[PDB]
Amino acid sequence: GISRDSMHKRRATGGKQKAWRKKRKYELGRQPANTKLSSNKTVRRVRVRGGNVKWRALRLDTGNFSWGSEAVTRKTRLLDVVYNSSNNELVRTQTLVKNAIVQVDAAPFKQWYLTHSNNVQRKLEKRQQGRTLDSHIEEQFSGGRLLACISSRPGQCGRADGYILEGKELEFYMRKLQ
Amino acid sequence: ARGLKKHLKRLNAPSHWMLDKLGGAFAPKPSSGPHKARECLPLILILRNRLKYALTYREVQSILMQRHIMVDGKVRTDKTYPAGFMDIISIPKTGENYRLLYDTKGRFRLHSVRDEDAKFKLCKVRSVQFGQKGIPYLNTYDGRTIRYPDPLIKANDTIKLDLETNKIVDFIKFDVGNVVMVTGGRNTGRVGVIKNREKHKGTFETIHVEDAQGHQFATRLGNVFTIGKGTKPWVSLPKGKGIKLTIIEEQRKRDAAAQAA
Amino acid sequence: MAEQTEKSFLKQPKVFLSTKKADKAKRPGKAGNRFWKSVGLGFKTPREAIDGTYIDKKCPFTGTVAIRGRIIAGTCHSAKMNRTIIVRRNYLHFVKKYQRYEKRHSNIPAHISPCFRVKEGDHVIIGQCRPLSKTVRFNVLKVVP
RNA sequence: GGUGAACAGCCUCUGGCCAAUGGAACAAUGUAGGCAAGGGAAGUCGGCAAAACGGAUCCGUAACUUCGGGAAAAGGAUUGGCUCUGAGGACUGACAGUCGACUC
RNA sequence: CCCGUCGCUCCUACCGAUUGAAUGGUCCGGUGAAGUGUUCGGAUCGCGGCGACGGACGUCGCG
RNA sequence: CCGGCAUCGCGCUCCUAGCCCGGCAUCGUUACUUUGAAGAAAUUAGAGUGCUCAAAGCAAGCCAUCGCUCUGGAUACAUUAGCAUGGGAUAACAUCAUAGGA
RNA sequence: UACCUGGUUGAUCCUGCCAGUAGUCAUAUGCUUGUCUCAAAGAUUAAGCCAUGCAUGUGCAAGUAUGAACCAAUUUGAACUGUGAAACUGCGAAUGGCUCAUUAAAUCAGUUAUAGUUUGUUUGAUGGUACGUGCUACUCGGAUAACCGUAGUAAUUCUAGAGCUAAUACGUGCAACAAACCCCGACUUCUGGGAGGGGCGCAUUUAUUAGAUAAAUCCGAUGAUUCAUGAUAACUCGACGGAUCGCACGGCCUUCGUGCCGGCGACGCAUCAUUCAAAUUUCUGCCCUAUCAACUUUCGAUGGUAGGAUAGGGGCCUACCAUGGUGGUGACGGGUGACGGAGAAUUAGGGUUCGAUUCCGGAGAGGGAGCCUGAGAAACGGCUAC
Ligand SMILES: [Mg+2]
Ligand SMILES: [Mg+2]
Ligand SMILES: [Mg+2]
Ligand SMILES: [Mg+2]
Ligand SMILES: [Mg+2]
Ligand SMILES: [Mg+2]
Ligand SMILES: [Mg+2]
Ligand SMILES: [Mg+2]
Ligand SMILES: [Mg+2]
Ligand SMILES: [Mg+2]
Ligand SMILES: [Mg+2]
Ligand SMILES: [Mg+2]
Ligand SMILES: [Mg+2]
Ligand SMILES: [Mg+2]
Ligand SMILES: [Mg+2]
Ligand SMILES: [Mg+2]
Ligand SMILES: [Mg+2]
Ligand SMILES: [Mg+2]
Ligand SMILES: [Mg+2]
Ligand SMILES: [Mg+2]
Ligand SMILES: [Mg+2]
Ligand SMILES: [Mg+2]
Ligand SMILES: [Mg+2]
Ligand SMILES: [Mg+2]
Ligand SMILES: [Mg+2]
């Protein structure tokens, strides 16, 4: 089947390469899992070299997302794919791969920001002193969604994980999604 | 091939076993163990070849199945167990003990010793590093991993190791001025004293070692193994005191033994 | 910025630009400070690498690559690829029968960081890294023009 | 006007006509126009007549040659509708705004 | 001493209409077994809920 | 044959550092030679050893050829490429005249 | 032993070849042949084709024995006892043996690298939490061989149905602290707090943070790491964290109760290290040929960025982008009666020629291809298709 050998390639000079060997299993590839964004959740195991196991996520609906400036990580649900820096056709088909741009619920992160009298206040005034809250991340909350970037390998581990966009990286994609 | 190799044909065996090229088609294949199978001596060789307590492959099998033989403190049934440098081989039935150390000609010797030297061995540390939950531990070149060592034992150092309580009972800080026995190359066995170490960023470092009687030689840091702090050893050197020599000299020695005989 | 010229926004791994608490005084790659690294073996990281703004995952001083293996010197032969050069190695091959020499050569592709600058026929020292493409296994460390 | 490369063919608007003796029926033989299983030039002086091919895009193209050709040689693949994506511009005050008919 | 045409005999190779013949390989195009992964599918098979009903059922549990 | 040095021998803080002192590392690159490392064995050369000799083999030999003694199983060559050490004759490539030199 | 002799002439001195003269771990052939030691042998043409037979199975005191036997044989309460065949289970059969067809920087050799990976096994170390509202463990599931018996098919380790019965096979399910820190947080007083009680093994994925200098208390490693490793926030429909098996008895009661103990071991799960290994990988090196001067690039050719896949690096593959890569120092292409080396013959030196073959590396099993199992195979004394 699929192979990762260099034999079928042309030499760097451009000359042909003859085949002195057959294809080996230690050299194989597998065809992708082209992971979907859909509520019919499904991850499927792979038996790989060494008797180890990998996870093909075929359909994924919820993820684990980090808000780094706040150092808060909460599970949320995946709403839709909005930008994919390799191929537009992954956006149209709503495929989850590493470095895809996705909007997420914002519901868990709004409530953590809602949190954080006598004992409780005399910390809530300690906090609320350093609030900055860029108007960009504020406006998204008013819309009910957060731009996020996947940073896991869903076809490799079976999880959609990522981080809320901030600062330059939020600003850059926002100009693109315009 | 499509997997491991389980046979050792005789011509392919390590030269320092002194197996004879017509004594059969294969050799004992050293099992996986604490020593690197090219710097080892299996048990089969020690019994049948050297000690001659046996005449065949099957006879050495039986001896171990009575369990007379113990290695490094523990009873070993394996026929091709990879005994190595500074192991102890002890047969309580005969009541005998051996350290495994090199000839000047670079071949393992069973060095007969008392009980009080059987209590301990020497090991050089491969590395010291943190582990699970930051619990310091060290690699030796004998496969052993000792957790909670002195924070003084750094890499390349040597340790005394009681076989009863099993933890570090002493250690030598590998550096210039101590006596060393070489465990590889053409200089293996030759003992002497570190006179200089010149390092080379991104390569192996070279050790300069001088026999007690002047002769100077060099190895790379891999094949070095401190025995004692300073000139004195912490182990009993073999039948020749680690001093290698010209071919003329041993020619002279025989005829010098052949003038008295 | 000028680095950001692609369909993805370019950033260094594990450097967090939007940090709540920042300090220039900390180690590189912390508190928003550009990561930069010592390659070892006696080479010096150029200032343009240290206080650079380019992103290059393949750079010795800032990327994810480790120099190890062999260290070759040679002459730049062509500088017409994106961040890669071909360096010509010149050497003499002994012809045993005639007890004389002949001039042979080898062309070695090596990755060049944005921090350097090479023209046609400049003295370069390259270092071996993991394969970076079909033919590239070396990384330019010094350029003597 | 539409289709289209097109003053091609085909349909339409302005303008012009339905002027070509009518009715009934639907035999042979004609004349003009089609289609035919299996075979495929056996027909015939002779492939006469007919059939097959045919536009455009991509690929590929031998002998021979006066080196200009042969060449659209030969030989292949594609082609609707619908829903999208990218590229290629103008003006006005590496930007912002507005506009924009067309091609791939 | 000696050269070449010509006549006769043999040997080897050359050009040569014959869209000559055979064999093996390769480029492209057409068809495309079988496997592998994906999508529906669901024969039947496991607590055989419940209705608390009279080994029988359907509401069924998810696997 | 050679260290170790003075002549009109560009430094050393950092390691080796003598009883104020030898013997310091980066601010041009190489070939060439010197020594070493690390180099599979079998084969080649070569030591020992009276398989009766030899081709071979890696043995065996003395003891009271008596409850064991003594053991051996050396060593070398290995073109080129790579690593390290000193030499710096010879021979390459690069380069002090905008002084942007020390 | 660094060596020559015959042949052009009427004779001479040359050039120059022909011929002789020696060997081959170099093959066949012919004639001949008494003894001892030694040992090559269907490689060359046909990697052409095969009748028959064998070459891979396996059992311990230590997973499972009334399924039918054997030897003790029972005092007829308990034993299937002691030995066992079959059979289920686990492991192995990926090594070795054979050959050299394809293969010309390719395999291969010396030499590198992995900080870019997997690794059954060995050896060493290591292992808490399953849910209980972590205020100390929370209960035991049917059904399948050997066997009994009904059968089909010409058919063979072709095959169906019913009746039993085992588990270290299969599936569940009890779990060991201060919780060590961290977040809420009734009230208390005002907090820099005390806080009642709710949330935390190990793995997995992601993110944040720590992992320290330089001379007038900083503390692991490398030539070099955002390294080792720690803290935190969560995430998983978790692979895991013992319902297993031997002999040996031998301290003492708490109800004197196989009574509380507590030993040495056999097997097993998980992380790190090691070992046996591979997979890629750097530099240099290979025969003849120019009547083979350009080759590669649409459809991967050379690089870039993002992904996907892999055990992992990489145009390995995908989308977008750029126009590169090799070549008289011979690219590309052709020939090879071409696997590479260690080596072999011959040797004054320098050389010339050989290397299928017993060691090492590679590759293949009639030709192609695709796979399952497994730590390891693109396996052929495994399967699937042509
Ligand atoms: Mg073995
Ligand atoms: Mg038109
Ligand atoms: Mg018209
Ligand atoms: Mg017809
Ligand atoms: Mg006709
Ligand atoms: Mg006719
Ligand atoms: Mg006719
Ligand atoms: Mg005619
Ligand atoms: Mg006609
Ligand atoms: Mg024509
Ligand atoms: Mg050199
Ligand atoms: Mg001669
Ligand atoms: Mg003449
Ligand atoms: Mg004559
Ligand atoms: Mg001759
Ligand atoms: Mg094999
Ligand atoms: Mg273990
Ligand atoms: Mg790329
Ligand atoms: Mg990539
Ligand atoms: Mg061949
Ligand atoms: Mg052959
Ligand atoms: Mg055959
Ligand atoms: Mg094979
Ligand atoms: Mg096969
Ligand atoms: Mg067979």
The structure's method of determination equals cryo-EM
Chain C CB contacts of B201 under 8 Å are: 40-42
Q: Answer yes or no: are the C-beta atoms of C41 and C80 closer than 8 Å.
A: no
Q: Please answer yes or no on whether A172 and C16 come within 8 Å at the CB atom.
A: no
- C144: tokens are 């003597």
Residue C65: exposure state from Cβ atoms within 10 A (0-12, 13-18, ≥19): buried
Scanning the structure block, which residue is given the tokens 């954080």? Answer: A116
Q: Please answer yes or no on whether C9 and A172 come within 8 Å at the CB atom.
A: yes
Widest distance between CA atoms in chain B: 69
Q: Are strands C100-111 and C138-144 parallel, antiparallel or unpaired?
A: parallel
Distances B200 to B55, B194, C42, C68, C72 between C-alpha atoms, Å: 50, 17, 11, 14, 17
Strands (E), chain B: 8-9, 26-27, 41-42, 70-71, 74-75, 82-83, 88-91, 96-102, 108-113, 120-129, 137-140, 145-147, 158-162, 168-172, 179-181, 191-198, 206-210, 216-220, 226-228
Q: How far is the CA of C47 from the C1' of G264 (A)?
A: 68
**Å from CA of B2 to ligand 16 middle:** 8
**Within a 10 A sphere around the Cβ of C26, how many other Cβ atoms?**
11
**A169 φ, ψ to 5°?**
-70, -35
d(CA A104, CA A94): 14
CA angle, B213 as apex, B207 and B214 as ends, to 5°? 55
- C120: tokens are 């046609």
Q: At what angle do helices A167-177 and A135-143 cross, to 10 degrees?
A: 50
- B85: tokens are 């440098």
d(CA B15, CA B38): 9
**C123 φ, ψ to 5°?**
-75, 120
Residue A133: exposure state from Cβ atoms within 10 A (0-12, 13-18, ≥19): exposed
d(CA B218, CA B185): 10
> Which one-letter DSSP state was computed for residue B234?
S
d(CA B100, CA B119): 14
Q: Answer yes or no: are the C-beta atoms of B100 and B51 closer than 8 Å.
A: no
Contacts of B164 (CB under 8 A, 6+ apart): B73, B119
Task: Tell which residue, B6, C134, B2, C135, has the closest CA to residue A26.
Answer: B2
Positive or negative torsion for Cα B244, B245, B251, B256: negative
Bases of chain D with protein Cβ within 7 A: 84-85
CA dihedral B69, B72, B77, B82 (to 10 degrees): -110
Task: Tell which residue, B171, B157, B158, B209, has the closest CA to residue B188.
Answer: B209
Bases of chain G with protein Cβ within 7 A: 93-97, 102-104, 106-107, 112-116, 118-126, 183-195, 202-213, 220-226, 228-237, 239, 271-285, 295-297, 300-320, 322-327, 329-333, 350-352, 358-365, 369-371, 373-380
* Nearest nucleotide (C1') to alpha carbon of B20: F58
Task: Tell which residue, B150, B88, B155, has the closest CA to residue B120.
Answer: B88
**Within a 10 A sphere around the Cβ of B161, how many other Cβ atoms?**
24
**Within a 10 A sphere around the Cβ of A8, how many other Cβ atoms?**
9
Q: Answer yes or no: are the C-beta atoms of B76 and B70 closer than 8 Å.
A: yes
Whether the CB of B9 is less than 7 Å away from nucleic strand G comes out as yes
d(CA A95, CA A33): 10
Whether the CB of A3 is less than 7 Å away from nucleic strand D comes out as no
First-last CA distance in chain C: 30
Residue B172: exposure state from Cβ atoms within 10 A (0-12, 13-18, ≥19): buried
If you write DSSP's letter for every residue of A31-88 in order, what string do you get?
-----EE-SS-EEEEEE-GGG-EEEEEEEE-EEEEEEGGGTEEEEEEEEEEEE-SS-H
Widest distance between CA atoms in chain A: 81
Resolution of the experimentally solved model in angstroms: 2.9
Q: Which helix (H) or strand (E) holds A123?
A: helix A118-124
Sheet holding B145-147, edge to edge: B145-147, B137-140, B120-129, B158-162, B168-172
d(CA B214, CA C74): 44
If you write DSSP's letter for every residue of C70-108 in order, what string do you get?
-EEEEEEEEEEETTEEEEEEEEEEEETTTTEEEEEEEEE
B3 interfacial to chain C (CB closer than 8 Å) = no
Residue C62 one-letter amino acid: T
Task: Tell which residue, B89, B95, B76, B22, has the closest CA to residue B50.
Answer: B89
Burial C28-52 (b: 16+ CB within 10 A, else e): ebebbbebbbebeeebebbeebeeb
**Å from CA of A88 to ligand 14 middle:** 100
**B84 φ, ψ to 5°?**
-140, -155
- B154: tokens are 């750094």
d(CA B142, CA B60): 25
Chain C CB contacts of A150 under 8 Å are: none
- A134: tokens are 């860029």
